[PDB]
Amino acid sequence: IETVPVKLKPGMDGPKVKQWPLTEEKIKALVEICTEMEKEGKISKIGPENPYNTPVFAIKSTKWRKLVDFRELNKRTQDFWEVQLGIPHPAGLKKKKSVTVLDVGDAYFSVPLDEDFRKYTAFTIPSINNETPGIRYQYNVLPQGWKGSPAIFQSSMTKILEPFKKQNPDIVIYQYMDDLYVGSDLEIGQHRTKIEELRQHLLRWGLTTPDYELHPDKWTVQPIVLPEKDSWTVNDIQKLVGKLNWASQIYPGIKVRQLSKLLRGTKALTEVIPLTEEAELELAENREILKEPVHGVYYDPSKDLIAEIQKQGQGQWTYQIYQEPFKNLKTGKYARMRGAHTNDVKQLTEAVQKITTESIVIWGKTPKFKLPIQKETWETWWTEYWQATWIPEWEFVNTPPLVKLWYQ
Amino acid sequence: PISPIETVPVKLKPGMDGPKVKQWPLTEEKIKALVEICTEMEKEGKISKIGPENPYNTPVFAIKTKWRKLVDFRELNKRTQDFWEVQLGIPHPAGLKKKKSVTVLDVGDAYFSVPLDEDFRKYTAFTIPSINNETPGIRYQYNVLPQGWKGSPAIFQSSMTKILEPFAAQNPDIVIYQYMDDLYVGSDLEIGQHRTKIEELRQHLLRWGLTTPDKKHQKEPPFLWMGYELHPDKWTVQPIVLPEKDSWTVNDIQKLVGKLNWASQIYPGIKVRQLSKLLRGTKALTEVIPLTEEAELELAENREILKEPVHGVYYDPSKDLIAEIQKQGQGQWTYQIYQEPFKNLKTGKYARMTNDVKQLTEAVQKITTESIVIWGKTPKFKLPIQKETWETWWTEYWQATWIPEWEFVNTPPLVKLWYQLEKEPIVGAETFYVDGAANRETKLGKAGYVTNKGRQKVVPLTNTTNQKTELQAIYLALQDSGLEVNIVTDSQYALGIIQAQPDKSESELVNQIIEQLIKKEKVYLAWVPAHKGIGGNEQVDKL
Numbered sequence: 033i034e035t036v037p038v039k040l041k042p043g044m045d046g047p048k049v050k051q052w053p054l055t056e057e058k059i060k061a062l063v064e065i066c067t068e069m070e071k072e073g074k075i076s077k078i079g080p081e082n083p084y085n086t087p088v089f090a091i092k093s094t095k096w097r098k099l100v101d102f103r104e105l106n107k108r109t110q111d112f113w114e115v116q117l118g119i120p121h122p123a124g125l126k127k128k129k130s131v132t133v134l135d136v137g138d139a140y141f142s143v144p145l146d147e148d149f150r151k152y153t154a155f156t157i158p159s160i161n162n163e164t165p166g167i168r169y170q171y172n173v174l175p176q177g178w179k180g181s182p183a184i185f186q187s188s189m190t191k192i193l194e195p196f197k198k199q200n201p202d203i204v205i206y207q208y209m210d211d212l213y214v215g216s217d218l219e220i221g222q223h224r225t226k227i228e229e230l231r232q233h234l235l236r237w238g239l240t241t242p243d244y245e246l247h248p249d250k251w252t253v254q255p256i257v258l259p260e261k262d263s264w265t266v267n268d269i270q271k272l273v274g275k276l277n278w279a280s281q282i283y284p285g286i287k288v289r290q291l292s293k294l295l296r297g298t299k300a301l302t303e304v305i306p307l308t309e310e311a312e313l314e315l316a317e318n319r320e321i322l323k324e325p326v327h328g329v330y331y332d333p334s335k336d337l338i339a340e341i342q343k344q345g346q347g348q349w350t351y352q353i354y355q356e357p358f359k360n361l362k363t364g365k366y367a368r369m370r371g372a373h374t375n376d377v378k379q380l381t382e383a384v385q386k387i388t389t390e391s392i393v394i395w396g397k398t399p400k401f402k403l404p405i406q407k408e409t410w411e412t413w414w415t416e417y418w419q420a421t422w423i424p425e426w427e428f429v430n431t432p433p434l435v436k437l438w439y440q
Numbered sequence: 441p442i443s444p445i446e447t448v449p450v451k452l453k454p455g456m457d458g459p460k461v462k463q464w465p466l467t468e469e470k471i472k473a474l475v476e477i478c479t480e481m482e483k484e485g486k487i488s489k490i491g492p493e494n495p496y497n498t499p500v501f502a503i504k505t506k507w508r509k510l511v512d513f514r515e516l517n518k519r520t521q522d523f524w525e526v527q528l529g530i531p532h533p534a535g536l537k538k539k540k541s542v543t544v545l546d547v548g549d550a551y552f553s554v555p556l557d558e559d560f561r562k563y564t565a566f567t568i569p570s571i572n573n574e575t576p577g578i579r580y581q582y583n584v585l586p587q588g589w590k591g592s593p594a595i596f597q598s599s600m601t602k603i604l605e606p607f608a609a610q611n612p613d614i615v616i617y618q619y620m621d622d623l624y625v626g627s628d629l630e631i632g633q634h635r636t637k638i639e640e641l642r643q644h645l646l647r648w649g650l651t652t653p654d655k656k657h658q659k660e661p662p663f664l665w666m667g668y669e670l671h672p673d674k675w676t677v678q679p680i681v682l683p684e685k686d687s688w689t690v691n692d693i694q695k696l697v698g699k700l701n702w703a704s705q706i707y708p709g710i711k712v713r714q715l716s717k718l719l720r721g722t723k724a725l726t727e728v729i730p731l732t733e734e735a736e737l738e739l740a741e742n743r744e745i746l747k748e749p750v751h752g753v754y755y756d757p758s759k760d761l762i763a764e765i766q767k768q769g770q771g772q773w774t775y776q777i778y779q780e781p782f783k784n785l786k787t788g789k790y791a792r793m794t795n796d797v798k799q800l801t802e803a804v805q806k807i808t809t810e811s812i813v814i815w816g817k818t819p820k821f822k823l824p825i826q827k828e829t830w831e832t833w834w835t836e837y838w839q840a841t842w843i844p845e846w847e848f849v850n851t852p853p854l855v856k857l858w859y860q861l862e863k864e865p866i867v868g869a870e871t872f873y874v875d876g877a878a879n880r881e882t883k884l885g886k887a888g889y890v891t892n893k894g895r896q897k898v899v900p901l902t903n904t905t906n907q908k909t910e911l912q913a914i915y916l917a918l919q920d921s922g923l924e925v926n927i928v929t930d931s932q933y934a935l936g937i938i939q940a941q942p943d944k945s946e947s948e949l950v951n952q953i954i955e956q957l958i959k960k961e962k963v964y965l966a967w968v969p970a971h972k973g974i975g976g977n978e979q980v981d982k983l
């Protein structure tokens with residue numbers, strides 16, 4: 033097979049990202065995987081004249097998968113895979129009643145990679161205690177995790193999927209990186225059947241697939257809810273006013289002055305102030321503006337998507353995806369339902385992966401996360417529960433939120 | 441000498457040409473010793489003699505019982521492609537395993553022993569002047585890794601690594617560490633076998649053109665390596681010497697705090713808090729700084745623990761790994777890494793760049809990262825905190841946080857949380873409506889409160905900030921309140937600081953507030969929008 037030549041964006045030099053140190057268990061796993069892959073031609077050992085590098089990790093069933101972090105190499109070759117070989121994003125995938133996600137990364141491993149490009153796929157298995165230099169490979173085939181791989185392979189993919197698409201003209205199929213998202217409006221049971229058909233169909237054409245049932249019907253901007261309560265106190269009014277004031281930054285039509293007049297005299301926090309009709313109308317008038325959605329809230333595809341996550345306690349995390357402040361394109365919640373089985377970093381990591389999967393389905397792009405975690409902590413334990421082939425970009429927040437209940 | 445090793449191909453940075461540098465003639469006596477050495481390594485194939493056909497050139501110098509040849513390759517180095525980065529960092533003695541024997545081998549004339557890629561040799565050319573300087577010049581190039589060239593360390597490394605592979609396979613019981621131009625070979629074979637294998641290695645290497653020290657010249661332990669003392673069953677930092685001077689320069693303080701941290705991998709308890717507070721003052725380069733009083737006590741304490749010599753053991757992977765953490769004070773922590781109780785693998789300190797517990801978490805991170813680097817696993821931790829304390833703090837903290845398997849150790853100063861704020865306002869507690877302020881330019885301020893019972897105060901303030909008074913307001917309500925108080929403030933800044941449950945600070949205000957909050961029995965702190973018109977009439981009085 034001929035190799036699609038890959039030029040970089042001019043004036044860009046290849047990735048030079050230092051490799052994290054790894055537990056001995058994971059180094060051993062990586063050495064195993066790579067000895068096999070070198071044996072199958074998929075990668076080759078390289079010398080010191082190759083100065084580039086790209087981190088590698090080991091993640092997981094009961095077997096170790098290698099996971100290469102091509103985040104830098106992707107930005108450095110963005111034209112190739114977004115402009116030149118772009119894969120268009122189906123605006124109807126988000127509207128399907130069901131979306132299964134199929135791992136098809138194994139298709140790449142047969143297709144050769146351009147001989148002049150391989151140098152930039154270098155990676156290193158590190159050593160413990162710096163006892164040896166490090167084992168250096170570079171890829172000879174399209175690598176999993178690179179955004180060029182799927183772009184290069186979409187020709188072959190469009191052909192392999194043609195008979196299925198003709199037979200099932202209502203099923204939507206989108207390819208992000210190493211995964212196909214297939215949506216249908218079928219009964220859960222029909223859907224799982226149609227999916228085994230596609231699995232069998234892909235298998236009839238030499239594509240292996242191993243062995244998440246998402247539902248983008250309940251996927252919107254969730255509405256901010258005032259606490260309903262039978263009785264109200266000086267303090268309650270005070271939390272209530274504070275919540276409403278902050279929302280003013282989002283719906284400037286929050287009319288609350290009949291509440292500020294409510295308790296005008298310095299009163300104890302426990303004083304159970306009663307309800308004014310003039311005040312109560314400013315509360316129902318405001319709960320209505322809360323039911324409606326925002327104005328101006330549109331997806332600008334020239335810009336980047338931003339996700340903010342807040343820990344809420346008791347295993348509950350809230351998130352907002354936006355592009356400009358206060359103009360939320362989507363908000364939501366996550367909850368890990370296994371106590372004495374789940375811990376904070378597991379939750380943040382599962383949260384991060386659900387938000388990304390959502391974002392791929394709705395927009396075909398990933399957000400940059402604002403994570404509420406210490407940088408060094410996260411750089412140490414994310415692989416322990418990472419189950420995805422892509423890696424979104426991130427940065428860390430050190431300023432806490434003012435009122436976490438402001439989002440739930 | 442130049443070896444039958446296969447050369448690593450090298451090319452110049454894209455769209456660059458080789459150096460064409462100027463060669464101003466030099467001492468006639470120099471030009472003599474140069475050719476005496478220059479044609480003595482030509483006969484060894486390290487260099488050759490080329491005509492003016494090649495246009496590139498580089499300058500050459502002399503230095504000194506003999507002389508020595510030098511080539512500043514700075515102009516070429518800027519022009520040759522980048523390579524793989526020669527390993528950054530060093531193996532820590534804490535992470536070596538006890539081997540019955542360890543031989544050190546340093547390769548002679550390493551870079552000159554490795555061929556340089558043929559089609560890149562033109563770019564190494566130089567000219568030796570003809571004294572008369574109008575007389576013609578003799579032109580040489582290199583056939584081997586030139587001294588101090590950009591590619592040399594990294595190509596040398598990969599040649600050595602390759603040459604090792606055939607021997608590493610025949611002898612899987614021995615262990616070669618590589619470091620720059622040295623080989624460190626351990627083994628658990630009876631000293632006769634090990635000495636036989638060392639000679640097998642030397643001969644191997646010699647046939648690849650790498651000379652190496654005979655048994656007579658093989659260094660003997662303890663080993664003086666990278667500022668360590670490597671005894672066959674123990675390691676320590678080399679002798680560390682702290683000067684007793686009267687005056688102290690910026691540089692003198694830099695060199696001292698360095699020799700101290702260095703010592704802290706293995707000497708427990710060392711502190712650098714006050715010593716470094718001084719340099720943090722300004723970026724002065726050689727200004728003299730008066731030794732402060734507290735710093736002086738620190739240096740005295742450091743000098744005491746340094747008076748006696750301390751040692752560490754090496755790693756045994758069958759025996760698990762433990763890390764123990766002590767709090768020292770003013771945001772200073774110490775920890776030890778060991779496998780059995782009477783010798784440590786290594787020691788160290790963490791410092792605050794905050795809550796006592798948060799810092800502990802950050803220290804467990806620092807250690808965790810270091811363990812992974814040095815041994816490939818994480819320690820089990822012995823920690824001075826009650827499990828119930830930890831579970832309470834993390835469940836309520838806004839960051840996610842991870843705590844590898846750990847155990848409580850009832851060795852004070854234990855780590856505790858000192859107060860907690862009420863989740864909901866207190867019935868039967870006076871409610872205080874505090875506020876504060878100041879003027880940017882004027883620098884005067886006012887702080888006060890107004891309670892529901894009708895009580896009111898205002899205090900004038902000099903040399904204060906809108907933020908420093910908003911905390912003064914809160915301190916007023918705590919000074920003048922019963923054991924249960926509701927406070928209400930329009931300052932997120934002040935709410936933030938208090939909610940952070942800080943354990944101490946440099947800000948003495950905040951320390952007083954802390955001693956109040958620990959004194960109080962129930963405090964509920966609550967926030968309202970500023971300038972909204974609800975009980976905030978207290979801002980008028982402070983205004």
Ligand SMILES: CCC(=O)N(C)CCOc1cc(Cl)ccc1Oc1cccn2cc(C#N)cc12
Nearest residue numbers: 536538539542615624625626663665670671672
């Ligand atoms: C004195 C030695 C000793 O007896 N022990 C038990 C420590 C283990 O050191 C090695 C273990 C193995 Cl497996 C192989 C080689 C070892 O030597 C070194 C390892 C790292 C750095 N080095 C720098 C020098 C000097 N100069 C020597 C060593």
Ligand SMILES: [Mg+2]
Nearest residue numbers: 051086087156
């Ligand atoms: Mg790597």
